[PDB]
Amino acid sequence: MENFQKVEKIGEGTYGVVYKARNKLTGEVVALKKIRETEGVPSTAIREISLLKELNHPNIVKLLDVIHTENKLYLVFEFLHQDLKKFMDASALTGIPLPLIKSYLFQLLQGLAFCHSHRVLHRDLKPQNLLINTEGAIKLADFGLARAFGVPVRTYTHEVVTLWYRAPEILLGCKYYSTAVDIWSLGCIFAEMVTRRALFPGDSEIDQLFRIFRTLGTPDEVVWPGVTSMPDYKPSFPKWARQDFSKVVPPLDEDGRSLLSQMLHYDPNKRISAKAALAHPFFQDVTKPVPHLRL
Instruction: Identify residue 286 by its one-letter amino acid code.
Output: V
Distance CA 119, CA 114 (A): 9
**Taking the CA of residue 260 as centre, how many other CA atoms within 13 Å lie in the half-sphere pointing to its CB?**
25
Is residue 155 near ligand 0BY by the rule CB under 6 A?
A: no
Residues in contact with 56: Cβ distance below 8 Å, sequence separation at least 6, in sequence order: 62
Residues 165-194 close enough to bind ligand 0BY by CB under 6 A: none
Q: Per-residue x/- marks for ligand 0BY, 25-44, CB under 6 A?
A: ------x-x-----------
Q: How far is the CB of 227 from ligand 0BY (least distance, A)?
A: 32
Is residue 129 near ligand 0BY by the rule CB under 6 A?
A: yes
Q: Is 16 annotated as a binding residue?
A: yes
Q: Is 228 annotated as a binding residue?
A: no
Is residue 74 near ligand 0BY by the rule CB under 6 A?
A: no
Residue nearest to ligand 0BY (CB): 31
Q: Is 169 annotated as a binding residue?
A: no
**Of 65, 89, 124, 255, which one is the catalytic site residue?**
124
Where does 4-133 show beta strands of DSSP type E?
8-13, 16-22, 29-35, 63-69, 72-78, 82-83, 130-132
Of 145 and 272, nearer to ligand 0BY (C-beta) is 145
Q: Is 142 annotated as a binding residue?
A: yes
Q: Is 124 a catalytic residue?
A: yes
Question: Of 41, 60, 61, 264, which lies in the binding site for ligand 0BY, with binding defined by CB under 6 A?
Answer: 61
Residues in contact with 119: Cβ distance below 8 Å, sequence separation at least 6, in sequence order: none
Report the candidate in 242, 112, 226 with the shortest Cα–Cα distance to residue 169. Answer: 226
Question: Of 21, 52, 60, 80, which lies in the binding site for ligand 0BY, with binding defined by CB under 6 A?
Answer: 80
Is residue 124 near ligand 0BY by the rule CB under 6 A?
A: no
The helix-helix angle for 254-263 and 180-195 (nearest 10°) equals 140
Distance CA 171, CA 23 (A): 41
Is residue 261 near ligand 0BY by the rule CB under 6 A?
A: no
Q: Is 144 annotated as a binding residue?
A: no
Distance CA 265, CA 153 (A): 26
DSSP at 243: P
Task: Name the strand (E) or helix (H) holding 92.
Answer: none
Distance CA 264, CA 212 (A): 10
Q: How far is the CB of 111 from ligand 0BY (least distance, A)?
A: 14
Q: Is 286 annotated as a binding residue?
A: no
Task: Name the strand (E) or helix (H) holding 49.
Answer: helix 43-52
Is residue 162 near ligand 0BY by the rule CB under 6 A?
A: no
Distance CA 172, CA 231 (A): 6
Q: How far is the CB of 7 from ligand 0BY (least distance, A)?
A: 10
Residues that bind ligand 0BY (CB under 6 A): 10, 13, 18, 31, 33, 61, 75, 77, 79-83, 86, 128-129, 131, 141-142
List the catalytic residues. Answer: 124
